[PDB]
Amino acid sequence: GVPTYLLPGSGQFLTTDDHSSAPALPCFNPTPEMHIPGQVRNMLEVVQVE
Amino acid sequence: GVPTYLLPGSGQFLTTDDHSSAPALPCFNPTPEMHIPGQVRNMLEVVQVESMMEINNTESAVGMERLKVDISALTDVDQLLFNIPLDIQLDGPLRNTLVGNISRYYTHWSGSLEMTFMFCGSFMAAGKLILCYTPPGGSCPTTRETAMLGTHIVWDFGLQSSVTLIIPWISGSHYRMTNANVGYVTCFMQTNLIVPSESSDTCSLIGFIAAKDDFSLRLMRDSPDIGLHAAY
Amino acid sequence: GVPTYLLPGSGQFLTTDDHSSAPALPCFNPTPEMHIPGQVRNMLEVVQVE
Amino acid sequence: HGVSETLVENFLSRAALVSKRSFEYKDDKNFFKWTINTRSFVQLRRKLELFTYLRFDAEITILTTVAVNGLPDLTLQAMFVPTGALTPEKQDSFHWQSGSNASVFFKISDPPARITIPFMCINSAYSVFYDGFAGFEKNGLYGINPADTIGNLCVRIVNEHQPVGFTVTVRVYMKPKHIKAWAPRPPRTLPYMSIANANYKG
Amino acid sequence: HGVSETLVENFLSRAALVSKRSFEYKDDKNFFKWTINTRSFVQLRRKLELFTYLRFDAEITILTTVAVNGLPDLTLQAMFVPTGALTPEKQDSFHWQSGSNASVFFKISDPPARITIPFMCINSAYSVFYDGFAGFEKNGLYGINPADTIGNLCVRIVNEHQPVGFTVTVRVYMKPKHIKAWAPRPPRTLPYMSIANANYKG
Amino acid sequence: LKLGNSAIVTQEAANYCCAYGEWPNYLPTQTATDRFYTLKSVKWETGSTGWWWKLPDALNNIGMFGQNVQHHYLYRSGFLIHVQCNATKFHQGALLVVAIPEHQRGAHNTNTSPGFDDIMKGEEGGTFNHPYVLDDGTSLACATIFPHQWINLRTNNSATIVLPWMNAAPMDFPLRHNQWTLAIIPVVPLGTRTTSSMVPITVSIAPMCCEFNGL
Amino acid sequence: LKLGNSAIVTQEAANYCCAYGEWPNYLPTQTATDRFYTLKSVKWETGSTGWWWKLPDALNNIGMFGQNVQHHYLYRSGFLIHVQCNATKFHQGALLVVAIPEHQRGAHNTNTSPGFDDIMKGEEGGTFNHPYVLDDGTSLACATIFPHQWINLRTNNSATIVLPWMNAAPMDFPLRHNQWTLAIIPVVPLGTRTTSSMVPITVSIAPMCCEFNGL
């Protein structure tokens, strides 16, 4: 086995964490992306409109 | 040691997980694979095999009465023999088919179907049918003249006792508000059934349906078909 | 640290598992192997004797 | 420069509370059911209604609180029932042992149960706004796209009936991820009147 | 294209409930025994009976629920007894300390106990249907292949007798894996009448 | 501005607007529908709150488009809209000709959704009740986030907006779902010293790149 | 169709069916058994529900195959089945000649399994009680998932199905376990204007590539 030890902050739910969770439905292929016009990638694009 | 910390979702049993568990019996060698014929690697291989429609979709047709439509002298010159509502989901001619049963394990189907109709009268039985295809949203025709104005085929079964009818690519679950309407395949008489006097005057059609190679199925669910006597 | 999550089957004792445990006595050198005659490495050697 | 904080992936992916409901425990018939939408809370509703089309995977975190009316250690099931499947109507229905519905079995003592629901639409994005009618006739409902229904999140207590009676508060936290967004809209200036529609009072 | 969801590995590998049984605890004599088959629930029975021959490894997950008639922390043993070995008839029999039977010792507080049972047939696949007789004479049973018996899953509570009396519900979840399948069959249209056979009422 | 057997022989062919920087292309059955459908002119007055037309609902009963809508079942089209507002040099006022994707309307001071009759108006279109909130709770002030043009009668009299296919789906139901709402809101009201100033506004909608399915 | 000292001198030698795309090969003791065994002809009438024969149970008491079955102990064989249904051009009807692997039958309206006498019928074979569910709860409509042929008397009179070894095991007990069920179900019933129309159906089963063990 691997000797491990738990840290402080183990088993906590921080609401701003970025971890890969488990897919509820694996092996489901979603609808493919089609081109929709007017894609927003940055909210500073919205602010620069008068 | 290794500093670790547990995540949310730790020690949960998600029923759709794919993790290597522990072998209960390691060091047991199973029986080796031998070649068994007819291996299924994809359930779309099953769906592309044609199976009989219950084209006699009338009330009080029971059992193998449902598998065939009788053409006789009581069917006039331009009467509607059958219509096939193209709902795979709903209780129609397509329900108890291979394309109809395996699609009810999935939520979203999409693809082209094909309908083979086979004429099972005598050798010298002649006549003409007219198999029209109604696209989705359009209304089912009630007259032979309305059927020949749509996408149709004029099938002389005088010597050709099989007609394939390709149903174009649908996308299935894109037309629901409960599956609504996916189209119709109807059949009208064009002529009378012309038989000699030694052949039976009542002849029959059987219809088949398979899905084509562009057919697709996704989002797997349970089948609503199935709902015990005699281990503990 | 390392983000981990426990699986089903964690902390179970399956009696047919093959994991390296902890030596109770490390740094004890055992008696070295000498040649003893008639070593059995397979129980099918026993079965083939009439 | 500083543009990486107003990214739409950063603007929208926050694990906000999308559902908080208590249910009791005695002999929603004593279980949790929630239609997975985003119009429950107006703080998250107004951020997603800055856009016309959204495409995200949801990351549901389920946080269970117990309080007895000495806390017991209980197993919960949280089953995602997509649009096309059948939801439970009772705590002990047969739909809780569906082979095809994605269930997750977790304890109170555990870290919170977290699953990722994929992109579930039959179109390429969820219509946040729908200038159309769901039914094929005039009796259909305005503003409701049949393609955009995620499904339902059904949560029960797996354990059979116990002598003590307790309240189970289920907090559901959804973090959208892999967010793509199209065609931005003006923010809503008036208060909401309903979750079904965009009516306004003044 | 989209064909990777109707793969037979994806069509059949779902951890469905194959056995749910409660047993009590006082002075199946107060333990769990289940003959590992697949005909217990008709939703999984009809999917596997779309085929003639199957070859899979089973992945048994055991989910234990306790409720006292304040929950105690108890050790359970779950022993797989293959065809050729002897099952317990009592809770305190000598077959629970078999050296050769694959036992797993787990707690209520743990994550659920998961083991993988290999491919256990003496033939290259399990006959889902068997047009034959098990006995070498006319008194044999029709539809039963002696080669296809997996074994039995025997679950008890390791702990000795306690003052409190409780009910232990054992849910068994089997996910078949490494599925190979041969010769597909029509789906069953009529309801089942028994688990022993393919009789039909109409 | 010459599509099909229709033609608009105007003069001040100013700059147009590709909506979201996109030109309508075909999706990789298709002269009949690609023509200007000049709607009935509306009268812009001093008390006008605004006008809207939902697309393709404003064209579902007109010509070779409205025949194909009611015979087919899926559609896919862009739109060329030409709004022209002809007045003298003694008129004043500004219009916001804005094209809104997915303009789900809301009703005022009720919790009941708008009905089929309140939304599907046809060639007549509708009139804004509360143009300041765009009849959907938002704001007219921020409505320049949508593909828009200005008609300042001091400066210009016409506006052209070129709309592509705006849908999450590749094709769509024309009788169920509207995708664009052409809205014309007078931001600065009309004015000349006569009080009954009645400037006409003409809307011409050419459905570009129409495709269909399901005859 | 000439195997051993047997021969079928028919005419319309149409297309055959390799079951699951497989030809019977030997397993890598073996002219005596490889011959056609022409069963007794059945009478197809207007009220016929169907006929079945289990393999090798239909051959376990016939000739050099039925001697070797009752002297040996393991077998391994494919089968060549030739069904021929000779009628005039004034008959009509369709047969589904389907070969079912592992056709575990079920009884009707009881929870008791079928007995030895209900399953092991021999050269006479059986008759379908409920051919619509294939006497096992499934469906006749989906029974074309199995290796099958059609006999439309309008089109063809014969059907040949070539069956390989279908077993999870390499060899098998012939007196215990049947592996193929040849089923002949009239989907469209028989018809000519005489009411007592009685078309014969002839079944010839050649066991291909027989191996044996345990004399």
Side-chain angles (χ1 to χ4, degrees):
Chain A
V2 181
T4 61
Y5 60 94
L6 297 176
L7 292 179
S10 177
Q12 73 183 4
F13 168 58
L14 177 63
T15 63
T16 62
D17 58 354
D18 186 71
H19 295 287
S20 68
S21 63
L25 297 175
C27 299
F28 170 72
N29 297 117
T31 305
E33 296 175 355
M34 73 178 288
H35 182 76
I36 304 171
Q39 182 178 1
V40 192
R41 293 173 178 176
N42 206 159
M43 295 300 289
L44 291 177
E45 301 175 358
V46 172
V47 174
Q48 295 171 5
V49 181
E50 63 186 4
Chain B
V2 181
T4 61
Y5 60 94
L6 297 176
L7 292 179
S10 177
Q12 73 183 4
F13 168 58
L14 177 63
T15 63
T16 62
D17 58 354
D18 186 71
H19 295 287
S20 68
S21 63
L25 297 175
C27 299
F28 170 72
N29 297 117
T31 305
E33 296 175 355
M34 73 178 288
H35 182 76
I36 304 171
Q39 182 178 1
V40 192
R41 293 173 178 176
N42 206 159
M43 295 300 289
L44 291 177
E45 301 175 358
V46 172
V47 174
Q48 295 171 5
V49 181
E50 63 186 4
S51 62
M52 286 184 280
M53 299 181 287
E54 289 179 354
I55 55 170
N56 193 5
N57 51 2
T58 71
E59 297 177 355
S60 69
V62 174
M64 289 183 62
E65 296 175 352
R66 297 182 63 84
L67 289 177
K68 63 183 181 67
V69 165
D70 287 333
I71 302 169
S72 67
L74 294 176
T75 64
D76 289 330
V77 185
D78 51 358
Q79 290 186 357
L80 174 284
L81 291 179
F82 56 89
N83 54 355
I84 302 166
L86 292 179
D87 299 326
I88 295 175
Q89 181 73 253
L90 294 179
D91 187 76
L94 302 183
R95 182 174 180 87
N96 198 357
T97 57
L98 289 171
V99 63
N101 283 315
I102 309 298
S103 298
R104 290 192 296 273
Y105 289 103
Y106 293 92
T107 305
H108 312 289
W109 62 272
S110 72
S112 295
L113 301 174
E114 60 181 359
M115 285 184 178
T116 308
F117 295 95
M118 184 178 173
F119 181 71
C120 300
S122 62
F123 183 81
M124 294 179 65
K128 286 179 184 287
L129 298 178
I130 173 163
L131 292 166
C132 66
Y133 171 66
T134 300
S139 295
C140 176
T142 61
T143 59
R144 196 269 316 156
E145 292 182 354
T146 308
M148 55 81 66
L149 294 174
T151 297
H152 72 280
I153 198 164
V154 182
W155 172 38
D156 185 72
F157 54 84
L159 195 149
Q160 181 180 358
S161 60
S162 292
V163 158
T164 304
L165 186 146
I166 303 296
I167 301 165
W169 182 78
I170 298 165
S171 68
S173 68
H174 193 266
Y175 310 107
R176 62 183 67 191
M177 65 180 177
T178 66
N179 200 4
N181 193 8
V182 186
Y184 293 99
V185 174
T186 73
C187 186
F188 292 88
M189 298 293 289
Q190 177 69 44
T191 65
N192 281 315
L193 185 68
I194 300 299
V195 297
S197 295
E198 293 85 17
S199 300
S200 180
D201 54 351
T202 300
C203 298
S204 292
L205 290 167
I206 54 175
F208 300 94
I209 190 159
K212 288 173 68 179
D213 54 353
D214 58 349
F215 192 79
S216 181
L217 289 166
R218 67 178 173 90
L219 206 158
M220 185 177 179
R221 63 186 177 92
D222 63 345
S223 182
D225 294 330
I226 200 67
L228 289 172
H229 295 280
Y232 294 102
Chain C
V2 181
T4 61
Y5 60 94
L6 297 176
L7 292 179
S10 177
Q12 73 183 4
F13 168 58
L14 177 63
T15 63
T16 62
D17 58 354
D18 186 71
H19 295 287
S20 68
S21 63
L25 297 175
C27 299
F28 170 72
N29 297 117
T31 305
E33 296 175 355
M34 73 178 288
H35 182 76
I36 304 171
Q39 182 178 1
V40 192
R41 293 173 178 176
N42 206 159
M43 295 300 289
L44 291 177
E45 301 175 358
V46 172
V47 174
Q48 295 171 5
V49 181
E50 63 186 4
Chain D
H1 292 90
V3 299
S4 68
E5 186 164 355
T6 65
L7 293 174
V8 178
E9 183 70 26
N10 298 114
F11 182 72
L12 291 177
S13 70
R14 295 292 180 96
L17 185 69
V18 289
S19 180
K20 183 172 78 72
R21 185 180 178 87
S22 298
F23 63 93
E24 292 289 329
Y25 186 84
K26 66 181 181 180
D27 295 335
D28 286 332
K29 290 183 178 181
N30 301 115
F31 68 101
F32 178 82
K33 184 259 180 180
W34 177 61
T35 299
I36 303 170
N37 55 0
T38 53
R39 294 181 180 177
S40 295
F41 293 97
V42 299
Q43 184 69 45
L44 182 61
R45 186 177 182 181
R46 188 182 183 272
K47 284 174 68 182
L48 298 176
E49 288 182 352
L50 299 177
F51 300 99
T52 310
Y53 299 109
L54 289 169
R55 182 187 172 97
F56 58 91
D57 298 327
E59 179 173 354
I60 305 300
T61 305
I62 299 165
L63 192 147
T64 292
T65 278
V66 69
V68 182
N69 293 319
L71 299 174
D73 183 66
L74 309 171
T75 303
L76 278 80
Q77 184 184 4
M79 182 173 66
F80 171 60
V81 185
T83 299
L86 295 172
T87 62
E89 294 177 354
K90 293 179 181 179
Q91 183 177 2
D92 48 351
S93 69
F94 293 105
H95 297 97
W96 291 107
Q97 55 260 22
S98 295
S100 292
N101 289 327
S103 296
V104 57
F105 289 92
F106 61 96
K107 290 179 180 292
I108 293 172
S109 63
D110 287 333
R114 185 183 288 172
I115 58 169
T116 297
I117 292 172
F119 176 72
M120 295 296 287
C121 186
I122 71 171
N123 298 325
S124 296
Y126 303 114
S127 298
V128 185
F129 291 90
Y130 186 70
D131 197 6
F133 292 90
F136 290 98
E137 294 179 354
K138 291 184 173 67
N139 56 0
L141 293 173
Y142 181 66
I144 294 170
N145 193 359
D148 294 339
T149 312
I150 310 294
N152 299 321
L153 182 65
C154 297
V155 178
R156 61 99 177 253
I157 299 168
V158 178
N159 299 323
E160 296 179 354
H161 293 286
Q162 291 179 355
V164 296
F166 47 85
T167 305
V168 173
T169 303
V170 172
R171 287 173 177 84
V172 177
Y173 291 90
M174 182 190 73
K175 185 174 80 174
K177 68 179 185 178
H178 299 288
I179 300 101
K180 294 173 73 72
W182 293 271
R185 299 178 73 90
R188 189 183 177 96
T189 65
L190 293 178
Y192 290 101
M193 294 185 75
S194 177
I195 67 168
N197 53 17
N199 292 332
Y200 59 93
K201 188 181 288 291
Chain E
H1 292 90
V3 299
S4 68
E5 186 164 355
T6 65
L7 293 174
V8 178
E9 183 70 26
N10 298 114
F11 182 72
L12 291 177
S13 70
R14 295 292 180 96
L17 185 69
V18 289
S19 180
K20 183 172 78 72
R21 185 180 178 87
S22 298
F23 63 93
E24 292 289 329
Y25 186 84
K26 66 181 181 180
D27 295 335
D28 286 332
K29 290 183 178 181
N30 301 115
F31 68 101
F32 178 82
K33 184 259 180 180
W34 177 61
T35 299
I36 303 170
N37 55 0
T38 53
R39 294 181 180 177
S40 295
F41 293 97
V42 299
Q43 184 69 45
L44 182 61
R45 186 177 182 181
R46 188 182 183 272
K47 284 174 68 182
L48 298 176
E49 288 182 352
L50 299 177
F51 300 98
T52 310
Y53 299 109
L54 289 169
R55 182 187 172 97
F56 58 91
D57 298 327
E59 179 173 354
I60 305 300
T61 305
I62 299 165
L63 192 147
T64 292
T65 278
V66 69
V68 182
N69 293 319
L71 299 174
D73 183 66
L74 309 171
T75 303
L76 278 80
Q77 184 184 4
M79 182 173 66
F80 171 60
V81 185
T83 299
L86 295 172
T87 62
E89 294 177 354
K90 293 179 181 179
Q91 183 177 2
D92 48 351
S93 69
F94 293 105
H95 297 97
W96 291 107
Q97 55 260 22
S98 296
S100 292
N101 289 327
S103 296
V104 57
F105 289 92
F106 61 96
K107 290 179 180 292
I108 293 172
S109 63
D110 287 333
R114 185 183 288 172
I115 58 169
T116 297
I117 292 172
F119 176 72
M120 295 296 287
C121 186
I122 71 171
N123 298 325
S124 296
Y126 303 114
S127 298
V128 185
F129 291 90
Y130 186 70
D131 197 6
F133 292 90
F136 290 98
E137 294 179 354
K138 291 184 173 67
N139 56 0
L141 293 173
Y142 181 66
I144 294 170
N145 193 359
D148 294 339
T149 312
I150 310 294
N152 299 321
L153 182 65
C154 297
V155 178
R156 61 99 177 253
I157 299 168
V158 178
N159 299 323
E160 296 179 354
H161 293 286
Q162 291 179 355
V164 296
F166 47 85
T167 305
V168 173
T169 303
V170 172
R171 287 173 177 84
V172 177
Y173 291 90
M174 182 190 73
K175 185 174 80 174
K177 68 179 185 178
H178 299 288
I179 300 101
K180 294 173 73 72
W182 293 271
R185 299 178 73 90
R188 189 183 177 96
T189 65
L190 293 178
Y192 290 101
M193 294 185 75
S194 177
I195 67 168
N197 53 17
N199 292 332
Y200 59 93
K201 188 181 288 291
Chain F
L1 297 174
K2 183 173 74 72
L3 272 73
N5 53 1
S6 64
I8 301 171
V9 284
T10 184
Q11 307 94 24
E12 299 180 357
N15 196 3
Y16 63 93
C17 179
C18 284
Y20 297 113
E22 293 291 326
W23 190 261
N25 55 359
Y26 291 99
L27 188 60
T29 183
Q30 298 176 356
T31 60
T33 62
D34 301 342
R35 69 186 298 277
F36 287 101
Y37 295 95
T38 307
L39 305 179
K40 188 182 174 182
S41 294
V42 299
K43 295 181 182 293
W44 175 28
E45 296 176 355
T46 63
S48 297
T49 63
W51 299 271
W52 54 267
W53 292 270
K54 292 185 179 293
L55 292 170
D57 178 67
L59 301 178
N60 285 332
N61 290 317
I62 298 170
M64 294 302 292
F65 188 82
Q67 292 295 324
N68 287 318
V69 160
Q70 293 177 355
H71 290 294
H72 295 282
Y73 183 66
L74 299 176
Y75 84 112
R76 188 191 186 278
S77 66
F79 294 100
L80 203 156
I81 297 173
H82 178 72
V83 173
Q84 189 173 2
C85 178
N86 51 8
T88 62
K89 288 185 181 293
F90 298 102
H91 291 99
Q92 71 191 7
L95 294 170
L96 180 61
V97 178
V98 60
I100 306 166
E102 299 288 328
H103 183 67
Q104 176 178 352
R105 294 177 61 85
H108 178 73
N109 200 3
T110 183
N111 56 2
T112 305
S113 297
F116 189 83
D117 296 331
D118 296 328
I119 301 298
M120 306 296 281
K121 295 287 182 66
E123 190 271 331
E124 296 181 355
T127 297
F128 284 98
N129 297 315
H130 300 88
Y132 179 69
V133 299
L134 291 175
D135 287 338
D136 58 356
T138 61
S139 63
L140 178 64
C142 302
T144 62
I145 194 67
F146 295 128
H148 71 284
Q149 285 276 314
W150 287 95
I151 298 176
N152 194 1
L153 296 179
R154 180 178 172 88
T155 299
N156 52 359
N157 54 1
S158 71
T160 300
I161 303 170
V162 176
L163 300 176
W165 179 249
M166 186 60 65
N167 212 176
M171 295 187 79
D172 201 6
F173 302 100
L175 296 175
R176 292 294 97 195
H177 180 63
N178 293 320
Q179 298 184 354
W180 292 102
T181 301
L182 176 70
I184 300 170
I185 302 101
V187 176
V188 176
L190 196 72
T192 190
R193 293 183 190 177
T194 189
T195 68
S196 70
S197 183
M198 293 167 69
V199 171
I201 303 172
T202 301
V203 174
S204 297
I205 300 165
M208 295 176 70
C209 293
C210 296
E211 291 180 353
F212 289 98
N213 276 318
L215 182 62
Chain G
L1 297 174
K2 183 173 74 72
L3 272 73
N5 53 1
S6 64
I8 301 171
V9 284
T10 184
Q11 307 94 24
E12 299 180 357
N15 196 3
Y16 63 93
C17 179
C18 284
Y20 297 113
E22 293 291 326
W23 190 261
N25 55 359
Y26 291 99
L27 188 60
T29 183
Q30 298 176 356
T31 60
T33 62
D34 301 342
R35 69 186 298 277
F36 287 101
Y37 295 95
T38 307
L39 305 179
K40 188 182 174 182
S41 294
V42 299
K43 295 181 182 293
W44 175 28
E45 296 176 355
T46 63
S48 297
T49 63
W51 299 271
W52 54 267
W53 292 270
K54 292 185 179 293
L55 292 170
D57 178 67
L59 301 178
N60 285 332
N61 290 317
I62 298 170
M64 294 302 292
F65 188 82
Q67 292 295 324
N68 287 318
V69 160
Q70 293 177 355
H71 290 294
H72 295 282
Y73 183 66
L74 299 176
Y75 84 112
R76 188 191 186 278
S77 66
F79 294 100
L80 203 156
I81 297 173
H82 178 72
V83 173
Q84 189 173 2
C85 178
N86 51 8
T88 62
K89 288 185 181 293
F90 298 102
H91 291 99
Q92 71 191 7
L95 294 170
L96 180 61
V97 178
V98 60
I100 306 166
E102 299 288 328
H103 183 67
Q104 176 178 352
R105 294 177 61 85
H108 178 73
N109 200 3
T110 183
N111 56 2
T112 305
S113 297
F116 189 83
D117 296 331
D118 296 328
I119 301 298
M120 306 296 281
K121 295 287 182 66
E123 190 271 331
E124 296 181 355
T127 297
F128 284 98
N129 297 315
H130 300 88
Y132 179 69
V133 299
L134 291 175
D135 287 338
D136 58 356
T138 61
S139 63
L140 178 64
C142 302
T144 62
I145 194 67
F146 295 128
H148 71 284
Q149 285 276 314
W150 287 95
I151 298 176
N152 194 1
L153 296 179
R154 180 178 172 88
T155 299
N156 52 359
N157 54 1
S158 71
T160 300
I161 303 170
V162 176
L163 300 176
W165 179 249
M166 186 60 65
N167 212 176
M171 295 187 79
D172 201 6
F173 302 100
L175 296 175
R176 292 294 97 195
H177 180 63
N178 293 320
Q179 298 184 354
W180 292 102
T181 301
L182 176 70
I184 300 170
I185 302 101
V187 176
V188 176
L190 196 72
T192 190
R193 293 183 190 177
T194 189
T195 68
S196 70
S197 183
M198 293 167 69
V199 171
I201 303 172
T202 301
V203 174
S204 297
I205 300 165
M208 295 176 70
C209 293
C210 296
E211 291 180 353
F212 289 98
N213 276 318
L215 182 62

